[PDB]
């Protein structure tokens, strides 16, 4: 499916390449659904930046407003933090850094939350001899393990859901990982500049295809995002 996505500051909707696109994110959010949406991204960035600052009572006005689930990430490094997102009616947890670097405290997560609850969002760069490497984001070096290493660390306690964004083709990379795991539910993020880059990943094998920014630049509508990945 087509995973419209918004990042918001401060109860604001930014582009990131930032730019201010108003403060209107439920309006926004419900027209996306309308269109026909299943599934909703949001990026909390203030709460990336600080925690204690968890955008929870715009994010819960959100969740109420639409009909759809909503899967939200951004900082979410302890499981304080998870319990808070999926209280405040959160369909399902986006985390980031925290799943590199302390894996056996996210397989706890998993244990206590459901697989059905968690996205692991991966940030893959290839290296120099084709390795698809993890890195935390997308202004530090690589940590070390590869996309696949990773993925395999979480098999064991029922990792469903990946988001995989490329940081270093795009088509071949999610060719092979949803190729080579196929229990797991891969949404790809970042690239999609035009329709035709949505119509690229149709026969990858991913499952979900995050379109933020092409939207807000009115490239597309989500309807015709969604007749495009039918097709
Ligand atoms: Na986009």
């Known amino acids: 499916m087509i995973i419209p996505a918004l990042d918001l500051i401060d109860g604001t909707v930014v582009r990131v390449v930032q730019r201010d696109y108003g403060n209107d994110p439920l309006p926004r959010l419900q027209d996306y659904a309308a269109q026909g949406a299943g599934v909703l991204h949001l990026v909390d960035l203030t709460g990336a930046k ?22 939200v990430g951004g900082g979410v490094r302890t499981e304080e933090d998870v319990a808070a997102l999926l209280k405040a009616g959160v ?27 968690l996205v692991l969002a991966l940030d893959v760069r290839i290296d120099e001899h084709g390795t698809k490497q993890v890195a935390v984001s997308g202004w530090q070096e690589n940590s070390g393990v590869s996309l696949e290493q990773l993925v395999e660390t979480y098999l064991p306690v029922g990792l469903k859901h990946v988001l995989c964004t490329d940081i270093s083709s795009n088509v071949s990379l999610y060719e092979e990982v949803c190729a080579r795991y196929p229990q797991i539910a891969f949404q790809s993020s970042g690239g999609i500049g035009d329709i035709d880059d949505i119509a690229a990943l149709r026969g990858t094998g991913v499952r979900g295809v995050i379109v933020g920014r092409a939207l807000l630049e009115g490239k597309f509508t989500v309807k015709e995002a969604i007749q495009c990945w039918q097709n």
Do not use: M, Y
């Open 91 to 117: 369909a399902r947890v986006v985390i980031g850094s925290t799943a590199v670097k302390s894996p056996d405290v996210v397989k706890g997560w998993f244990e206590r939350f459901g697989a059905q609850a």
């Open 50 to 71: 600080d925690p204690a600052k968890r955008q929870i009572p715009l994010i819960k006005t959100l969740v109420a407003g639409v009909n759809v689930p909503v899967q």
